[PDB]
Amino acid sequence: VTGIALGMIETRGLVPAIEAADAMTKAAEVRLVGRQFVGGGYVTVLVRGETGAVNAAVRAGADACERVGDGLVAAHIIARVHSEVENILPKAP
Amino acid sequence: GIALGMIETRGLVPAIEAADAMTKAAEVRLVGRQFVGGGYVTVLVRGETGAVNAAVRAGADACERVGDGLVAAHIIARVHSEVENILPKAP
Amino acid sequence: GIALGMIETRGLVPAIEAADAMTKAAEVRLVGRQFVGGGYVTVLVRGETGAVNAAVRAGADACERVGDGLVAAHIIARVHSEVENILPKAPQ
Amino acid sequence: GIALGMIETRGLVPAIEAADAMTKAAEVRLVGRQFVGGGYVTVLVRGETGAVNAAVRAGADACERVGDGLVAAHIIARVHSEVENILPKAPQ
Amino acid sequence: GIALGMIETRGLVPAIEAADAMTKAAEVRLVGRQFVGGGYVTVLVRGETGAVNAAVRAGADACERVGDGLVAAHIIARVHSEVENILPKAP
Amino acid sequence: GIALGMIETRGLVPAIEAADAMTKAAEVRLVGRQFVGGGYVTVLVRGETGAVNAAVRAGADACERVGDGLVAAHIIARVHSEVENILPKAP
Amino acid sequence: GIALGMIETRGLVPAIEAADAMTKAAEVRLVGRQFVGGGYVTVLVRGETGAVNAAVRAGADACERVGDGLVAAHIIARVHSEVENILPKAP
Amino acid sequence: GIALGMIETRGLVPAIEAADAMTKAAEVRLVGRQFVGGGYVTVLVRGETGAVNAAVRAGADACERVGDGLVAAHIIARVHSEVENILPKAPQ
Amino acid sequence: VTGIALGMIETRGLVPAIEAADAMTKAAEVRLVGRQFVGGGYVTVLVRGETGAVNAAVRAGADACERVGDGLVAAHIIARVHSEVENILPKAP
Amino acid sequence: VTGIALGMIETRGLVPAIEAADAMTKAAEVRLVGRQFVGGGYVTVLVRGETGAVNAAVRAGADACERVGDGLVAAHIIARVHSEVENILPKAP
Amino acid sequence: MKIMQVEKTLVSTNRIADMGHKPLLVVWEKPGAPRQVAVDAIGCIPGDWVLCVGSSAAREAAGSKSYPSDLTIIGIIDQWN
Amino acid sequence: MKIMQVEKTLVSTNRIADMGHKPLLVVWEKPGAPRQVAVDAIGCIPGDWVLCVGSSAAREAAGSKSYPSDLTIIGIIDQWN
Amino acid sequence: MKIMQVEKTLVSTNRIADMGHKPLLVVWEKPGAPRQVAVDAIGCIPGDWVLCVGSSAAREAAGSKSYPSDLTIIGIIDQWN
C-alpha cells in the first residue's frame, strides 16, 4: 500500500480501539502503522493509505467502534501530512 | 484458533478474575494482559469461535461484580491480518 | 502454595497497609505489588487456600479504613495454569 | 528561531491535528510531542515570533473542534535561557 | 541559595509559563520539571528567600489563567537536608 | 467433542422429544437418559461447542410445550475431568 | 462445513452488503445469490457452526439500514441431505 | 479499480439517470444493470475508492428526484474475494 | 435520424407505454430504440434523436400518457449519453 | 536588534510606565528607545523591533500595567513608521 | 457567460463539506488553453461544448444562495464548432 | 474554480482583525506564474495541487458571510500532474 | 488576495461623499506593471509589500457593507522579496 493520508481514531480503552482497527483494515485498503497509549485511558490507532481509502476506513471504524466499550472519542482524517509531523507519527507498530 | 476475545476491566483484580474464569470455562489460550492506563486493564485470548464465545461470556459474567466492575467484552470471529501486528503473542 | 489472594486499593498507603495485614495474619508470600495506573495498586499473595483466605479477609478489614479505601478483595483457590503466565513471582 | 509555541489537548488526535495545522500554517519546527499523562498531550514549536504566533493561532482554531478539544494555546516571544533546559529539542 | 519554590499545574503549558515567568521575574535557578502523573506538572527552583518569594508570586500570578489553571504554589525558606535526597539537582 | 448439553423435563415424553429434536438439529452424540426421581428426566449429549449449543437451543424450544414442560437447559463448554466420573458414557 | 446461513433482503444492494460483511466477518464460503422475485434477494453460505453464526449476525447487523432493509436471517446447524438438492453449490 | 458502487431505484428511468450521472461524475466502469424484480433496478460500478465515492454521491443526488426515487446508494471500498463471484463483469 | 439524446418514459402497464411511444413518435422526429419490461408493472420506452426533438417528444408523450391506464411514473431527458451507458441502452427493439 | 516597528504604551504616572517598559522588554526582544513626559501625568514609553516581537511586547506590557497605579491609557502598534515621524520619535533615552 | 469545452472529470476527496454532492469537470476553451474547474449542474461527457457562468450567478446555478462555487455549467450548446 | 499549486506559507502580523486565525498560502499555477495568496480552509503542504475558488464564494469558503477574502482553497486534488 | 507593492499616495479632492476619510495608495506588482489604486485600511509607507483583496470582500475590508471600493489593503507582508 502507498499514500500519505493519515486516519486517526481515539477510543476510551483498548477493546474499542482494537475493534476500530479491525473494522478499518477490513473495510478499506489501509495500513495499521501504530497503536498509542495516550494515558488516562485514551488509545489512538493510526492508518495510512490513499485519501478515499482512508476516508472509507475511518468512517467504517468510527461507526463500528462508537458503541463497544466506553465509546469513541475522536475520528479525524488528514489528506497530506507535513514532513515535520512524520517525526512524531510512528512508522510501524 | 484465530478468534479473538477481550475484556476490559477497571482494575487488575477483575481482569485476573476474568482471565481465570475464561481459561477455566473454555479451552482457550491467554495471549496477553495490557495496562491501558487510567485504570483500564485488558485480557486477550485466542481459540476457536465457539470456545472463545463461551470463555468471554463466562468471564464477563464472573468479573461483573468483582472490583470496580466490567467495562467491555467483545468477540471477533476472524480478525484481519493487520491487527496481528498490534496483538500480543505472549504475555 | 497455589491459592492466590488479591487486594486493590486507591493509593499506595492502603496497599502497603493491606499487604502488611495479610502477611501478619497468615503464612503467605507476597509476590507482587502492581501499579495499575490511575491510582490503583494491587497486592498479590500465594499460599495454602485457607491461609490465603484468612489473610485476604484480615487485610481487607484492616485497610478498608485507611486512605481512599478498598476496591476489591478476592481469593482464588485454584489458579489455572495458563493464568500463571501473567502473575508476577517476585516483588519489585 | 527563539519563540516557543504551545498547544495542549485532551487526547492524541487533536494534538496531531494541531501540530499539522501549525506546521502547515507557518514556517516553524516541531520540537516535541509530550505525553503529560491523564490524557494531556502537548506540542511545542520554535521559530520567529510572528510565525510562531500565526502557527499557534491557526493550530488552536483548527484543533478546537476535533476530539475532546483544547486545553491551552500559548506563545512565548522570549524564552529565558534557564527555561531552555526543560524544552526538548528533537521529537521522539 | 537554599530556599525552595514550587508550583503545580494541571498541564504542561501552565508549568512552562510558570517557570518562564519565575526565572524572568527573579534571578533564581530552575532545578527540575516533574511529571507527577494524572496531569499534574511541578517546577522547582532554588535561590535566596526574597528572590524565591518574588519568583513564586510572579509564576503563580502568570499561570493562573493559562491552561487548566493553578494547583498549588509553595515556598520553603530552609528545607531539611533529608529532602535534598528527593529534590532533583538538574532537569 | 467435550462440550456437555443437558435438558431436564417434568416427564419422559418431553425428554424424548428434546433428545430427538437435539440429535436431529445438530450432529451431537446422545450419552444418557437419567430418571432423577419425582418426575424429572434428564438427557445429556457430547460434541463440539457450537453443535451442542445449537442442539440444546433446538431441544429447549421443541420441548417447551410438549408434556408438563421444560425445567432447565444448560451448556458446559469444557467440563472438568472430575465430572466425567458421574457423567454416563452410554445410555 | 455443513451449517447453512441465509439472509433475505428487499433489494440487491442490501444483499451484497450482507454477503460482503458476512464473508469479511467470518471465514465462510458464499454459495449463492438467488433472486426470489418481487424484490426479495437471498444469500447463502456454508461453514462451521460458530463461523456461520458469527457471519450471519454480522450480516444481519450490517444490512439492517442499507437499502429497504432486512427481511430474515436464519441459521441451520445441520441441514438434511434432501435440502442439498435445492441448495446451490456455486453462484 | 477494486471499489464497488451501488445504486438501487424503483424503475428503470431513475436507474439510467443514476448510471449516467455516476459515469459522467467520475472515472468508473459500469459493470452491471440488474433487474431485481418487483420494480428494483441496480447499477454497479468499479474503480478507485475516491472516484467511486464521488460517482455514487453524484448519482444518488441526481437521480433522487426522477421517477419513484432512490432505494439505496452504498459504496464498498474493499470487496471480499469470495463476493466477487456474484458481481457481474460486463453489462447486458 | 441522427443524434445521441435519449428520452425516457416510464408507465405502470403496457397500454400507457404504447400510447406514450405512439405520441412521442407522432409529435417529434425521434427513433423508438426499445421497450423494456422492468418488472412489477413498470414499462420503459426509449427514444433517440436531436435534443430539441427529444424534448418535444418527451413532453408530448408524458402529456398524452399521463391519464390512460395506471398512469405515468417518470419522464426524463438526457442531452448527451455517456459511452458506458450505451452498453445498457438497447440499440433496436 | 533590528526592525522599524514601533510600540507605544501610555500610562497615567511613572510607576505604571516603568512596569510596562520592564514587562515589554522581558516579554519580547525589543528596544527601549525612549520615555516621554507628556504633561498632565501622561507618560509614554516607546519600543522598536520586529512586527511580531513588538506585538507580543505591547500585549504583555498592557496586560501587566493595566492595574498598577492610575492605570493604562493607550497601547498602540505601528508596523512601518513613516520617515517623517522618525524626526519626532526619539532615538535613545 | 463563457463558452468552454469539457476535458475530463476531476475528483477531490478532501473537498469542504458544503460543496455537496455536485461533480466537478475540467473545462478549457480549446486544447492548450489554461484549464479551469467548473461545477457540473447539467451533466456533460468529455468533448462537448458547454455554457459556463461565473461570479455570484454561479452560486445560484449550483443550487444554493451560498454554494461555494465560482464557475458553474448551465447548459450544453446544441451546435458548435 | 481554478487549479493552483501551493508554493509557500505567507504570514502577515499586521493583518486586519476580522481575518481571524485562518492561515495564508502562496499559490501559483506553475513555477514562474504570477503569485497569489489564498486563505487555507483545508490544510495543504507545499507542492500539492489544490482547488481555489474566487469571488463571493471564497468568503463563504473561508467560513463566514463577511470574511475578508477573495481566494480560498476548498480542496486538494487527489491525482494531478 | 493578491500581493502588491505600494508606490505612492494618491489624493482625489472631488471623490464621492461615501468614500469617507480613508486614504488611497497606488499599488503595483513590480516597477513597470500596470498601476492600481487601493483603499488603505492598514497604513503603508511607499516601498513595502502588502496584501490586497478584491471583489465584495474589499468593501468589508474598507469598513462597511456598502463602501464604494473594489481593492483594499488588508495587511503588510512581514518578509518578502
Author numbering:
A (entry chain D), I (entry chain D), J (entry chain D): 4 to 96
B (entry chain C), E (entry chain C), F (entry chain C), G (entry chain C): 6 to 96
C (entry chain E), D (entry chain E), H (entry chain E): 6 to 97
K (entry chain 4), L (entry chain 4), M (entry chain 4): 1 to 81
The authors write:
The carboxysome comprises a polyhedral shell that encapsulates ribulose-1,5-bisphosphate carboxylase/oxygenase (Rubisco) and carbonic anhydrase (CA). HCO3− is accumulated intracellularly by membrane-bound transporters and CO2-uptake complexes and diffuses through the selectively permeable carboxysome shell into the interior; it is then rapidly converted to shell-impermeable CO2 by the encapsulated zinc metalloenzyme, CA. In comparison, canonical α-carboxysomes utilize β-type CAs, namely CsoSCA. In this study, we determined the homohexameric structure of CsoSCA from H. neapolitanus and investigated how it is recruited into α-carboxysome shells composed of CsoS1A and CsoS4A shell proteins, as well as CsoSCA encapsulation in the context of Rubisco.
We generated constructs that express either the NTD or CTD of CsoSCA, as well as a CTD deletion of CsoSCA; all three constructs contain a His6 tag fused at the C-terminus of CsoSCA for immunoblot detection. To investigate the molecular basis for these interactions, we evaluated the CsoSCA–shell association by performing single-particle cryo-EM on purified minishell/CsoSCAΔC and minishell/CsoSCA-C. Initial analysis of micrographs from a preliminary dataset revealed the presence of T = 3 and T = 4 shells in both samples, which is consistent with the shell population observed from expression of empty minishells. Therefore, we specifically purified T = 4 minishells by collecting elution fractions from ion exchange chromatography and screening for fractions enriched with larger minishells by negative-staining TEM. Despite these efforts, we were unable to resolve ordered internal densities in our cryo-EM maps. Closer inspection showed that the disordered internal density in both maps contacts the CsoS1A hexamer but not the CsoS4A pentamer. This supports our earlier findings and suggests that CsoSCA is likely localized to the α-carboxysome shell facet rather than the shell vertices. The minishell/CsoSCA-C map has less internal density than the minishell/CsoSCAΔC map, consistent with the smaller molecular mass of CsoSCA-C relative to CsoSCAΔC. In addition, the internal density in both maps appear to contact CsoS1A hexamers in proximity to their central pore regions, although this remains to be further validated in future studies. Careful inspection of the HnCsoSCA structure reveals that the CTD is buried within the hexamer, with very little exposed surface area. Therefore, while individual CsoSCA-C monomers might be able to interact with and be encapsulated within the minishell, this interaction may not be biologically relevant in the native α-carboxysome.
